[model samples]
Each structure stands twice: as C-alpha cells, then as structure tokens.
Target: GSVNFVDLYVCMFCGRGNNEDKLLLCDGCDDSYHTFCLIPPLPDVPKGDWRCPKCVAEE
Candidate 1:
C-alpha cells in the first residue's frame, strides 16, 4: 500500500488558503496569488497564459 499527499496552494500576498476567495496560479514562478491582492487587482480569472507581477518584472 502507498499513500500520496498533495499540497494546497497558498496566497503569496495574504498567506491564507482553503477559503472562499479566488486565487491565481503563476505559470512562471509557480506561486499562487489572489486576484484582489495583485497590484492592479484582476477583476476576474484571466483567459490564458497569466503571469504574476513578480515574474513579469523579472523578465
């Protein structure tokens, strides 16, 4: 028998998870951030290929 564990994604800004709030996963850094926590604050989930502010700045 084997057991597998999966990690829950946490908000990089607020540092909370498993709540009702929506979170966006950064394709670049793999860190999750809330839409409302973003610098400009995204109104809703993006369509495709979204990158976090930090990742954008780094590139």
Candidate 2:
C-alpha cells in the first residue's frame, strides 16, 4: 500500500483541532486557521470562497 500523506486539520495560529466549526481552510495555502485567530476575526464561518490573511496579503 502507498503511504498516506494527509495533513491534519487544525488552526495555524492556535494549532488546535478542538474547534472545527470555525476552522477556516485556506484554498490558496491549504492551511487551516481559526476564525477568532484571524486579524479581523470572523463570526463562525464566512459565506464562501474565503481566503486567509496571508493569502490576501500576497496580492
């Protein structure tokens, strides 16, 4: 069998998977971050096609 290289879903800032409800996954970086940890923190999850602060900063 091939080795599985799966990434664990957790907040990039807090590094905790305890809260998946607000863990926003970055489509650009593939990294997860809690909404509360964000610069302008989001209330729970956002609408759609959301990008992290870092992703937005690249532009």
Candidate 3:
C-alpha cells in the first residue's frame, strides 16, 4: 500500500502526523514512524529491512 501525503502518515508511537523529520517504514507491519519518535531514536536510516519494536516482539 502507498501512503499519500494527503492522507498524512502518523507515527504509531507518537500518534502525530505531518512530521518534519525523516519517517521510517516498518517492513513487518507497514507502519510509518518518525526516526526520533522511536523509543531510542534511530540515528540514521537502517541498512536492511527494519521492523518496528512492536512487530519484532510479536514475532
């Protein structure tokens, strides 16, 4: 599925949309999240398939 800017991607963690920072897409659940919104805050774009913590725990 594609996330359109018109739809506005919200952070699964913060629950806020229109984030000015970089957003990371979870490979497992397809949820969009701001890098800084993450618990520990991702410093940069991950190299491989990145799964959000919630998805990781579910597996």
Candidate 4:
C-alpha cells in the first residue's frame, strides 16, 4: 500500500514529534500544532469550535 501521506502529528511550528496527542489540527491554518507550542496561555482542552491563536485571528 502507498504509505507516503500519513500526516505525521508533528507540530507545524516547532517541528517536533513524540507528543502526537498534543498536536491540534487547525482547519483555518491548515497546519498542526500543540496547545502550548502555539498558545502557551491555553487552559487545557477546547470545548468546541476551538481554534488556534493564529486561526482565530482571522477576520
């Protein structure tokens, strides 16, 4: 089987691995990142419609 498109859970900002669970998918930014990696001020899991700082900055 073709195995080249497994979007590895690597933070798009820090470019680090191991914490795949921390990676957050941003539909607007089209990138992956951890809560702390992008938003150090995040207070844990997002309830719903959660967006990254940059993503939410969109107008």
Best by TM-score: 2
Q: All candidates' lDDT scores?
A: 0.61, 0.63, 0.63, 0.59
Backbone clashes in model 2, listed as residue pairs: none
User: TM-score for every candidate vs. truth?
Assistant: 0.56, 0.59, 0.52, 0.51
Which ten contiguous residues of candidate 3 have the minimum total lDDT? Answer: 1-10
Over 1-59, each residue of candidate 2 has an lDDT whose tens digit, in order, gives 22256563555556455565767777746456776666754765777877777678785
lDDT of 3 by residue, 2-47 (tens): 6545344456555455454567767635566666666755758777
> What lDDT score goes with residue 38 in model 3?
67
- Where in model 3 is the C-alpha error above 4 Å? 1-9, 12-21, 28-30
Q: What would the TM-score be for candidate 1 when compared with the true structure? A: 0.56
Tell me model 4's lDDT, rounded to 2 decimals.
0.59
Judge candidate 2 at residue 7 and give its lDDT.
Answer: 62
**What 10-residue stretch in candidate 1 is worst by lDDT?**
1-10
Span of ten consecutive residues with least summed lDDT in model 2: 1-10
Error of 1 at 43 (Å): 1.5
